[PDB]
Coordinates of C-alpha atoms in Angstrom, one line a residue:
Chain A
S1 CA -6.9 -20.4 -44.0
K2 CA -5.2 -17.0 -44.7
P3 CA -4.3 -15.4 -41.4
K4 CA -5.0 -11.6 -41.8
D5 CA -3.2 -10.2 -44.9
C6 CA -2.2 -12.8 -47.5
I7 CA -4.7 -14.2 -50.0
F8 CA -5.1 -17.7 -51.4
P9 CA -3.4 -18.3 -54.8
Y10 CA -5.8 -18.1 -57.7
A11 CA -7.9 -21.1 -58.5
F12 CA -6.9 -22.9 -55.3
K13 CA -10.4 -24.2 -54.8
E14 CA -10.5 -25.8 -58.3
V15 CA -7.0 -27.4 -57.9
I16 CA -8.2 -28.7 -54.5
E17 CA -11.3 -30.3 -56.2
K18 CA -9.2 -31.8 -59.0
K19 CA -6.8 -33.7 -56.7
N20 CA -9.7 -35.2 -54.6
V21 CA -8.2 -34.0 -51.3
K22 CA -10.6 -33.5 -48.4
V23 CA -9.5 -30.0 -47.6
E24 CA -12.1 -27.3 -46.8
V25 CA -10.7 -23.8 -47.3
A26 CA -11.7 -21.2 -44.7
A27 CA -11.6 -17.5 -45.3
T28 CA -10.9 -16.7 -41.7
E29 CA -9.3 -18.3 -38.6
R30 CA -12.7 -18.1 -36.9
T31 CA -14.2 -20.3 -39.7
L32 CA -11.3 -22.7 -39.3
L33 CA -11.9 -23.0 -35.6
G34 CA -15.7 -23.4 -36.1
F35 CA -15.1 -26.2 -38.7
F36 CA -12.7 -28.0 -36.3
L37 CA -15.2 -27.8 -33.4
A38 CA -18.0 -29.1 -35.6
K39 CA -15.9 -32.0 -36.8
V40 CA -14.8 -32.9 -33.2
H41 CA -18.4 -32.7 -32.0
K42 CA -19.8 -34.8 -34.8
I43 CA -17.1 -37.5 -34.7
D44 CA -16.9 -37.4 -30.8
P45 CA -13.6 -39.2 -30.3
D46 CA -12.7 -40.6 -26.9
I47 CA -8.9 -40.1 -27.2
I48 CA -7.1 -37.2 -29.0
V49 CA -3.4 -37.9 -29.7
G50 CA -0.9 -35.2 -30.7
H51 CA 2.6 -33.9 -30.1
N52 CA 3.4 -31.1 -27.6
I53 CA -0.2 -30.7 -26.8
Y54 CA 0.3 -30.0 -23.0
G55 CA 3.1 -27.5 -23.5
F56 CA 1.9 -25.6 -26.6
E57 CA -0.9 -26.6 -28.9
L58 CA -3.7 -26.9 -26.4
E59 CA -3.2 -23.4 -24.9
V60 CA -2.7 -21.9 -28.4
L61 CA -6.0 -23.4 -29.6
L62 CA -7.9 -22.3 -26.5
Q63 CA -6.5 -18.8 -26.8
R64 CA -7.4 -18.4 -30.5
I65 CA -10.9 -19.8 -29.8
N66 CA -11.4 -17.3 -27.1
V67 CA -10.0 -14.4 -29.0
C68 CA -12.1 -14.9 -32.2
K69 CA -15.2 -15.8 -30.1
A70 CA -15.7 -19.1 -31.9
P71 CA -19.2 -20.6 -31.3
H72 CA -19.5 -23.4 -28.8
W73 CA -16.0 -23.8 -27.5
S74 CA -17.3 -26.5 -25.1
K75 CA -17.6 -28.8 -28.1
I76 CA -13.9 -29.3 -27.6
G77 CA -14.9 -31.5 -24.6
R78 CA -18.0 -33.3 -23.5
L79 CA -19.7 -31.1 -20.9
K80 CA -21.6 -27.9 -21.7
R81 CA -19.9 -25.0 -19.9
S82 CA -20.2 -21.2 -20.3
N83 CA -17.0 -19.6 -19.0
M84 CA -13.6 -20.8 -20.1
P85 CA -10.8 -20.5 -17.4
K86 CA -7.3 -19.3 -18.4
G87 CA -7.7 -24.6 -15.9
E88 CA -5.9 -26.0 -18.9
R89 CA -6.4 -29.6 -17.8
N90 CA -10.2 -29.3 -17.2
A91 CA -10.8 -27.5 -20.5
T92 CA -11.1 -30.7 -22.5
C93 CA -13.1 -32.7 -19.9
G94 CA -14.8 -35.9 -21.3
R95 CA -11.9 -36.7 -23.6
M96 CA -8.4 -38.0 -22.8
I97 CA -5.5 -36.2 -24.5
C98 CA -2.5 -38.5 -25.3
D99 CA 0.7 -36.6 -25.6
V100 CA 3.1 -38.9 -27.4
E101 CA 6.1 -36.8 -26.3
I102 CA 5.3 -37.4 -22.6
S103 CA 5.0 -41.1 -23.1
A104 CA 8.2 -41.2 -25.1
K105 CA 10.0 -39.5 -22.2
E106 CA 8.4 -42.0 -19.8
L107 CA 9.3 -45.0 -21.9
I108 CA 12.3 -44.4 -24.3
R109 CA 15.6 -42.7 -23.6
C110 CA 16.9 -40.3 -26.3
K111 CA 18.9 -37.2 -26.7
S112 CA 15.8 -35.0 -27.4
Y113 CA 12.1 -35.7 -27.7
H114 CA 11.2 -33.5 -30.6
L115 CA 9.2 -34.9 -33.5
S116 CA 12.1 -35.1 -35.9
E117 CA 14.3 -37.1 -33.5
Chain B
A1 CA 63.2 18.9 -4.4
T2 CA 60.6 18.8 -7.2
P3 CA 57.7 16.9 -5.5
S4 CA 54.8 18.7 -3.9
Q5 CA 55.5 22.0 -5.7
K6 CA 52.3 22.5 -7.8
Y7 CA 49.9 21.8 -4.9
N8 CA 51.8 24.1 -2.5
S9 CA 51.8 26.8 -5.2
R10 CA 48.0 26.6 -5.6
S11 CA 45.9 29.7 -5.7
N12 CA 42.3 28.3 -5.2
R13 CA 42.7 27.9 -1.4
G14 CA 39.5 28.5 0.5
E15 CA 37.3 28.7 -2.6
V16 CA 33.7 27.4 -2.0
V17 CA 32.6 25.4 -5.1
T18 CA 29.2 24.0 -4.0
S19 CA 26.4 24.9 -1.6
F20 CA 23.2 23.3 -0.8
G21 CA 20.4 23.9 1.7
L22 CA 20.5 27.4 3.2
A23 CA 22.9 30.1 2.2
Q24 CA 25.9 30.2 4.6
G25 CA 29.2 32.2 4.7
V26 CA 32.6 30.8 5.5
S27 CA 32.5 31.0 9.3
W28 CA 31.5 27.4 9.9
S29 CA 32.3 27.1 13.6
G30 CA 31.1 24.5 16.0
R31 CA 31.3 23.6 19.7
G32 CA 34.0 20.9 19.3
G33 CA 33.6 18.3 22.0
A34 CA 31.0 20.3 23.9
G35 CA 27.5 18.9 24.4
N36 CA 26.2 15.4 24.0
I37 CA 27.5 13.5 21.0
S38 CA 25.9 10.2 20.0
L39 CA 28.1 8.1 17.7
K40 CA 26.8 4.5 17.3
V41 CA 27.2 1.9 14.6
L42 CA 23.9 0.2 13.8
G43 CA 22.2 -2.2 11.4
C44 CA 23.0 -5.9 11.0
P45 CA 25.5 -7.6 13.4
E46 CA 27.5 -4.6 14.1
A47 CA 29.5 -3.7 11.0
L48 CA 31.9 -6.5 11.7
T49 CA 34.5 -6.0 14.5
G50 CA 36.9 -9.0 14.2
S51 CA 39.5 -9.4 11.6
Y52 CA 37.6 -11.7 9.2
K53 CA 36.3 -15.3 8.8
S54 CA 37.8 -16.7 5.7
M55 CA 39.9 -16.3 2.5
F56 CA 38.3 -19.4 0.8
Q57 CA 34.8 -19.5 -0.6
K58 CA 32.5 -22.3 -1.8
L59 CA 30.5 -21.9 -5.0
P60 CA 27.2 -23.3 -3.5
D61 CA 27.4 -20.7 -0.8
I62 CA 27.6 -17.9 -3.4
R63 CA 24.7 -19.5 -5.3
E64 CA 22.7 -19.6 -2.1
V65 CA 23.5 -15.9 -1.3
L66 CA 22.4 -14.8 -4.8
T67 CA 19.2 -16.9 -4.7
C68 CA 18.3 -15.4 -1.3
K69 CA 18.9 -11.9 -2.6
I70 CA 16.6 -12.4 -5.5
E71 CA 14.0 -14.2 -3.4
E72 CA 13.7 -11.5 -0.7
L73 CA 13.7 -8.6 -3.1
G74 CA 11.1 -10.3 -5.3
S75 CA 8.9 -11.1 -2.2
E76 CA 9.1 -7.5 -1.1
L77 CA 8.1 -6.2 -4.6
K78 CA 5.3 -8.7 -4.8
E79 CA 3.9 -7.6 -1.4
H80 CA 4.1 -4.0 -2.5
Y81 CA 2.7 -4.2 -6.0
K82 CA 0.1 -7.0 -5.1
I83 CA 1.3 -9.3 -7.9
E84 CA -1.0 -12.4 -8.0
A85 CA 1.8 -14.9 -9.0
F86 CA 5.0 -15.1 -10.9
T87 CA 5.6 -17.2 -14.0
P88 CA 8.5 -19.5 -14.9
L89 CA 10.9 -18.0 -17.4
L90 CA 10.9 -21.1 -19.7
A91 CA 7.1 -21.7 -19.8
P92 CA 5.4 -20.3 -22.9
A93 CA 2.3 -18.1 -22.3
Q94 CA 0.3 -16.3 -24.9
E95 CA -1.1 -13.8 -22.4
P96 CA 1.2 -11.2 -21.0
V97 CA 3.1 -12.5 -17.9
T98 CA 5.2 -11.1 -15.1
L99 CA 8.7 -12.5 -14.4
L100 CA 11.1 -12.0 -11.6
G101 CA 14.8 -12.1 -12.3
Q102 CA 18.1 -10.3 -12.3
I103 CA 19.7 -8.4 -15.3
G104 CA 22.8 -9.7 -16.9
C105 CA 24.8 -9.5 -20.1
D106 CA 25.4 -12.5 -22.4
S107 CA 29.2 -11.9 -22.8
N108 CA 32.2 -10.4 -21.1
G109 CA 31.8 -6.9 -22.6
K110 CA 29.8 -3.8 -21.7
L111 CA 26.1 -4.2 -21.3
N112 CA 23.9 -2.8 -24.1
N113 CA 20.3 -3.1 -25.1
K114 CA 20.9 -5.9 -27.5
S115 CA 22.7 -8.1 -24.9
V116 CA 20.3 -8.1 -22.0
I117 CA 19.6 -11.4 -20.3
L118 CA 17.2 -12.1 -17.5
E119 CA 18.2 -14.9 -15.0
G120 CA 15.3 -16.3 -13.0
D121 CA 15.2 -17.3 -9.4
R122 CA 15.7 -20.8 -8.0
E123 CA 12.3 -21.0 -6.4
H124 CA 10.2 -20.4 -9.5
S125 CA 12.2 -20.9 -12.7
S126 CA 15.1 -22.9 -11.3
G127 CA 17.8 -20.4 -12.4
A128 CA 16.8 -20.2 -16.1
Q129 CA 18.1 -17.5 -18.4
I130 CA 16.2 -15.9 -21.3
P131 CA 17.1 -13.1 -23.7
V132 CA 15.1 -9.9 -23.2
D133 CA 13.9 -7.7 -26.1
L134 CA 13.6 -4.0 -25.2
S135 CA 12.2 -2.7 -28.6
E136 CA 8.7 -2.1 -27.1
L137 CA 9.9 -0.6 -23.8
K138 CA 9.5 3.2 -23.4
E139 CA 11.4 4.0 -20.1
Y140 CA 14.0 1.7 -18.5
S141 CA 17.3 1.8 -16.6
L142 CA 19.2 -1.4 -16.4
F143 CA 22.5 -2.5 -15.0
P144 CA 23.9 -6.1 -14.4
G145 CA 22.8 -7.8 -11.2
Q146 CA 19.6 -5.6 -10.9
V147 CA 16.8 -7.7 -9.3
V148 CA 13.8 -6.7 -11.5
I149 CA 10.2 -7.6 -12.2
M150 CA 9.2 -7.4 -15.8
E151 CA 5.8 -7.6 -17.5
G152 CA 6.0 -8.8 -21.1
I153 CA 5.0 -11.4 -23.8
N154 CA 6.7 -14.8 -24.1
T155 CA 4.8 -17.0 -26.6
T156 CA 7.7 -19.3 -27.5
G157 CA 9.4 -19.7 -24.2
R158 CA 12.8 -18.7 -25.6
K159 CA 12.6 -14.9 -25.6
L160 CA 10.8 -12.2 -23.7
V161 CA 9.5 -9.1 -25.4
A162 CA 9.3 -6.8 -22.4
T163 CA 6.5 -4.2 -22.1
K164 CA 6.6 -2.8 -18.6
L165 CA 9.4 -2.3 -16.0
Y166 CA 8.3 -2.0 -12.4
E167 CA 10.0 0.7 -10.4
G168 CA 11.8 -0.3 -7.2
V169 CA 10.7 0.7 -3.7
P170 CA 13.2 2.0 -1.2
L171 CA 13.4 1.0 2.5
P172 CA 11.5 3.1 5.1
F173 CA 13.3 6.0 6.7
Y174 CA 14.7 5.8 10.2
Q175 CA 12.0 6.5 12.7
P176 CA 13.1 9.2 15.2
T177 CA 12.7 8.8 18.9
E178 CA 11.7 11.5 21.4
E179 CA 15.3 11.5 22.7
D180 CA 16.8 11.9 19.2
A181 CA 15.0 15.2 18.6
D182 CA 16.3 16.8 21.8
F183 CA 19.9 17.1 20.5
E184 CA 21.4 20.4 19.3
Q185 CA 23.1 21.6 16.2
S186 CA 26.4 19.9 15.1
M187 CA 28.9 20.0 12.2
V188 CA 30.6 17.2 10.4
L189 CA 33.6 17.5 8.1
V190 CA 34.1 14.8 5.5
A191 CA 37.3 14.2 3.4
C192 CA 38.6 11.3 1.3
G193 CA 42.0 10.3 0.2
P194 CA 44.6 10.3 -1.2
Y195 CA 46.2 12.8 1.1
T196 CA 49.4 13.4 -1.0
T197 CA 50.2 14.3 -4.6
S198 CA 51.0 11.6 -7.1
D199 CA 54.8 12.4 -7.0
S200 CA 55.4 13.2 -3.3
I201 CA 55.4 11.6 0.1
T202 CA 55.4 14.7 2.3
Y203 CA 51.6 14.6 2.8
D204 CA 51.1 18.3 2.6
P205 CA 47.3 18.1 2.0
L206 CA 47.1 16.0 5.2
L207 CA 48.7 18.9 7.1
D208 CA 46.4 21.4 5.4
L209 CA 43.4 19.3 6.4
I210 CA 44.7 19.1 10.0
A211 CA 45.0 22.9 10.1
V212 CA 41.5 23.3 8.7
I213 CA 40.1 20.9 11.3
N214 CA 41.8 22.7 14.1
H215 CA 40.6 26.1 12.8
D216 CA 36.9 25.1 12.2
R217 CA 36.7 22.8 15.3
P218 CA 33.9 20.7 13.9
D219 CA 31.8 18.3 16.0
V220 CA 32.8 15.2 13.9
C221 CA 35.4 14.6 11.3
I222 CA 35.3 11.6 8.9
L223 CA 38.4 10.7 6.9
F224 CA 38.3 8.0 4.2
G225 CA 41.2 6.1 2.7
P226 CA 43.6 5.4 1.3
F227 CA 46.1 6.7 3.8
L228 CA 48.9 4.8 2.1
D229 CA 47.9 4.7 -1.6
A230 CA 48.5 1.3 -3.2
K231 CA 48.5 2.9 -6.7
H232 CA 51.2 5.5 -5.7
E233 CA 54.3 5.4 -7.8
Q234 CA 56.7 5.2 -4.9
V235 CA 54.6 2.6 -3.2
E236 CA 53.8 0.2 -6.1
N237 CA 57.6 -0.1 -7.0
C238 CA 58.6 -0.5 -3.3
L239 CA 61.0 2.4 -3.0
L240 CA 60.1 3.2 0.7
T241 CA 62.7 2.4 3.3
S242 CA 60.2 1.6 6.0
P243 CA 57.5 -1.0 6.4
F244 CA 54.0 -0.1 5.3
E245 CA 52.5 -0.7 8.8
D246 CA 55.1 1.7 10.4
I247 CA 54.3 4.5 7.9
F248 CA 50.5 4.0 8.4
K249 CA 51.0 4.2 12.2
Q250 CA 53.1 7.3 11.8
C251 CA 50.4 9.0 9.6
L252 CA 47.7 8.0 12.1
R253 CA 49.7 9.3 15.0
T254 CA 50.3 12.6 13.2
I255 CA 46.6 12.9 12.5
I256 CA 45.5 12.1 16.0
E257 CA 48.1 14.2 17.8
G258 CA 47.4 17.2 15.5
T259 CA 43.6 17.4 16.2
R260 CA 44.0 16.7 19.9
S261 CA 43.4 20.4 20.9
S262 CA 40.2 20.6 18.7
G263 CA 38.4 18.0 20.7
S264 CA 36.6 16.7 17.6
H265 CA 35.7 13.1 17.2
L266 CA 37.6 11.3 14.4
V267 CA 36.2 8.5 12.3
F268 CA 38.7 6.6 10.0
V269 CA 37.1 4.6 7.2
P270 CA 39.4 2.1 5.4
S271 CA 39.6 1.6 1.6
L272 CA 40.6 -1.2 -0.7
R273 CA 43.6 0.9 -1.8
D274 CA 45.4 0.6 1.6
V275 CA 48.5 -1.5 1.3
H276 CA 48.7 -2.5 5.0
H277 CA 45.1 -3.8 5.2
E278 CA 43.4 -6.8 3.8
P279 CA 42.1 -6.1 0.3
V280 CA 38.7 -7.8 0.7
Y281 CA 35.2 -6.1 0.8
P282 CA 33.8 -5.5 3.4
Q283 CA 36.8 -4.5 5.3
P284 CA 37.4 -4.8 9.1
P285 CA 38.1 -1.6 11.1
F286 CA 41.6 -0.3 11.3
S287 CA 43.9 -2.0 13.9
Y288 CA 45.6 0.4 16.3
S289 CA 46.9 -0.4 19.8
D290 CA 49.1 2.5 20.7
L291 CA 46.2 4.5 22.0
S292 CA 46.0 6.5 25.2
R293 CA 42.9 6.6 27.4
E294 CA 42.2 10.2 26.6
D295 CA 42.2 9.5 22.8
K296 CA 40.0 6.4 23.1
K297 CA 37.0 8.7 23.5
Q298 CA 37.9 10.8 20.5
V299 CA 39.2 8.3 18.0
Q300 CA 36.9 5.6 16.5
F301 CA 37.6 3.0 13.8
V302 CA 34.7 1.8 11.6
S303 CA 34.4 -0.7 8.8
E304 CA 33.6 -0.3 5.1
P305 CA 30.7 0.0 4.4
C306 CA 29.4 1.5 7.6
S307 CA 25.9 2.5 8.9
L308 CA 26.7 5.1 11.6
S309 CA 24.2 7.3 13.5
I310 CA 25.7 10.6 14.6
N311 CA 23.4 12.4 17.1
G312 CA 20.5 10.2 15.8
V313 CA 21.2 11.0 12.1
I314 CA 22.1 7.9 10.0
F315 CA 25.2 8.1 7.7
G316 CA 26.0 5.6 5.0
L317 CA 29.7 5.5 4.6
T318 CA 31.5 3.7 1.8
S319 CA 35.0 4.2 0.4
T320 CA 34.6 2.2 -2.8
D321 CA 34.0 4.0 -6.0
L322 CA 30.5 2.6 -6.5
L323 CA 29.3 5.5 -8.6
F324 CA 32.0 5.1 -11.3
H325 CA 31.7 1.3 -11.3
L326 CA 27.9 1.3 -11.7
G327 CA 27.7 4.4 -13.9
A328 CA 29.9 2.8 -16.6
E329 CA 27.7 -0.4 -17.0
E330 CA 24.3 1.2 -17.2
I331 CA 21.8 1.4 -20.1
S332 CA 18.9 3.9 -20.2
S333 CA 16.3 4.8 -22.8
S334 CA 16.8 8.6 -22.3
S335 CA 20.1 10.5 -22.8
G336 CA 19.1 14.0 -23.8
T337 CA 17.9 15.7 -20.6
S338 CA 18.5 13.3 -17.7
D339 CA 20.7 13.3 -14.6
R340 CA 22.9 10.2 -14.6
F341 CA 24.0 10.8 -11.0
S342 CA 20.4 11.0 -9.7
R343 CA 19.4 7.9 -11.6
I344 CA 22.3 5.8 -10.3
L345 CA 21.7 7.1 -6.8
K346 CA 18.0 6.0 -7.1
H347 CA 19.3 2.6 -8.2
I348 CA 21.6 2.4 -5.2
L349 CA 18.8 3.4 -2.8
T350 CA 16.2 1.1 -4.2
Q351 CA 18.5 -2.0 -4.5
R352 CA 18.9 -2.4 -0.7
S353 CA 22.7 -2.9 -0.8
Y354 CA 26.0 -1.0 -0.5
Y355 CA 27.4 -2.7 -3.7
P356 CA 24.5 -3.9 -5.8
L357 CA 26.4 -4.4 -9.1
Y358 CA 27.1 -8.0 -9.9
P359 CA 29.6 -9.1 -11.1
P360 CA 31.7 -6.3 -9.6
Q361 CA 34.5 -4.4 -11.4
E362 CA 37.4 -6.6 -12.5
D363 CA 39.7 -5.3 -9.8
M364 CA 37.3 -5.8 -6.8
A365 CA 37.6 -8.5 -4.2
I366 CA 34.3 -9.3 -2.5
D367 CA 33.6 -12.1 0.0
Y368 CA 30.0 -12.8 -0.5
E369 CA 29.4 -14.8 2.7
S370 CA 30.4 -11.7 4.6
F371 CA 28.9 -9.4 2.0
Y372 CA 25.4 -10.9 2.6
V373 CA 25.6 -10.1 6.3
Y374 CA 27.8 -7.0 7.0
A375 CA 27.0 -5.0 3.8
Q376 CA 23.3 -4.5 3.7
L377 CA 21.4 -1.2 4.3
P378 CA 19.3 -1.5 7.5
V379 CA 17.1 1.5 6.6
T380 CA 17.3 4.4 4.1
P381 CA 20.1 6.6 5.4
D382 CA 19.4 10.2 6.3
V383 CA 22.7 11.4 4.7
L384 CA 24.7 9.3 2.2
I385 CA 28.4 9.8 1.8
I386 CA 29.7 8.4 -1.5
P387 CA 33.1 10.0 -2.4
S388 CA 34.1 9.3 -6.0
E389 CA 36.5 10.3 -8.7
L390 CA 33.7 12.0 -10.6
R391 CA 32.8 15.7 -10.1
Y392 CA 31.7 16.8 -6.7
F393 CA 28.0 17.2 -6.1
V394 CA 25.2 17.2 -3.5
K395 CA 21.8 15.9 -4.5
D396 CA 18.5 15.3 -2.7
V397 CA 17.3 12.0 -4.1
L398 CA 14.3 10.2 -2.6
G399 CA 14.6 12.3 0.6
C400 CA 18.2 11.3 1.0
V401 CA 21.0 13.9 0.8
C402 CA 23.9 12.3 -1.1
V403 CA 27.2 14.2 -1.0
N404 CA 30.3 13.5 -3.0
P405 CA 33.1 15.9 -2.3
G406 CA 35.7 14.0 -4.4
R407 CA 39.3 13.2 -3.5
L408 CA 41.2 15.7 -1.4
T409 CA 44.0 15.5 -3.9
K410 CA 43.3 14.7 -7.6
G411 CA 46.5 13.9 -9.4
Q412 CA 49.1 16.6 -8.9
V413 CA 46.6 19.4 -7.9
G414 CA 44.5 19.8 -4.8
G415 CA 40.9 18.8 -4.3
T416 CA 37.9 19.5 -2.1
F417 CA 36.3 18.5 1.2
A418 CA 32.8 18.9 2.5
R419 CA 31.1 20.2 5.6
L420 CA 27.5 19.5 6.8
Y421 CA 25.3 21.1 9.4
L422 CA 23.0 18.7 11.3
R423 CA 19.9 19.4 13.4
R424 CA 16.6 17.6 13.7
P425 CA 13.4 19.8 13.4
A426 CA 10.0 19.2 15.0
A427 CA 8.7 15.6 14.6
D428 CA 5.2 16.5 13.4
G429 CA 4.8 17.9 9.9
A430 CA 5.0 16.6 6.3
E431 CA 6.7 13.4 7.5
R432 CA 10.1 13.7 5.9
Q433 CA 12.0 16.7 7.2
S434 CA 15.7 16.5 6.3
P435 CA 18.0 16.6 9.4
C436 CA 20.8 17.8 7.2
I437 CA 20.3 21.6 6.9
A438 CA 23.2 22.8 4.9
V439 CA 26.0 21.2 2.9
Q440 CA 29.1 23.1 1.6
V441 CA 31.8 21.6 -0.7
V442 CA 34.9 23.8 -0.4
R443 CA 38.3 23.5 -2.1
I444 CA 41.4 22.7 0.0

């Protein structure tokens, strides 16, 4: 998506279709968040695995969902709820989040646990 | 032959340079030793009486002292402003967050708006440091070692974009008792050293001050150091033919014997520029054993800094040049029409200390273990005495009358001293009614 100001390069949709890449272009961040929520709800995974989720990405995603008033934020979890607390652990109830960085700290010694290292 | 010529040949003798309160003439005459006089040192354990405790510190002790300072000030501000909870400095947060810390520069130079760093407390952020951005801040006034609470935006956890600066809250005023309001009017003279010109040892300004004290017969006289200047040319090169202790004793004896007929109480406050004393802040009271029984009721030795109630009126006495040390390392958003002295006085009164700047000036020895106990403000003083090399002034800041008469002798020419009239009005009214009625800064 284009955040607020920039615009997609011309014929981006056609080039996307030519190179058979499953990328759905969204005109707004709200559409992007709605698409992600719909994908999560339809797939319904048990475990979601990412990097720096519990110290960055999860709070950012929740904040941008709340700010843009994306429909059905509760699709990020498994229980239908109305009000979203500002309660980070309980936000994604029904699914277990696997932070690879945390397990790396708990298992492997290294100078730094960034993705590159 | 040459020394002490310019001061003796002065022509501005007796000129009044500043007045505050109610208009008064030149006939400032008191009762001397008549009536009831209540001189008592108050506060924490009493202003330290012994010599000292140590000349050897431990770094964890200093760490504990600083952490306690930050924690108590932050708890007081949280209780005042009803803050829900503080946030760790290193934890990212998209929503605006409030942080508790102390201001500091990132290098060894002068603090400026591009070099501000906030250092968190041990309880919350485990002593973490983050740079602070002041581009979006409208009004601020910052100096190193200022315990502050900021409200800003920290989305990456590595830099704070400050948006609001909470104003500090001073200590409550001293609550008068029914006995304190029954006292009568009194006069206090205040003077600060050095008492001799930069090229002489005759101490002519000291004799002039003795003559003025005898003439005006005030109720109390406060004399600040140095009595033997460490920066004096004849002292720093060791030209004197007598020990420093002997010369100090001679000067003290001359002062005490001269004002014996006046019957006015004398309060000697030491300074870090005294050669014969220990150069560590806070300083113990002057040591003097050749004292007769009659003079033991008229001569008192207090520490530095001191919280001293005179007739139920609290005085904050400090000989260090706090105004010049703090005023040089301050940053503010306004410079066109603003009083620097009032701003730094507000900082001093809201920081709850006698030397709030950290780290202090490069030539300043501070024992922090004794600083944490013997150098705290118990309450907001009724009158604050802060003599400084800057221009003489008398300002009413936050209900406190702060008077700086300046040095009695500046360089080769003479200086000024101050006199204050004290009386406590009726208790009931609009709460704060200043006991200090009139202040007059007069040239010597």
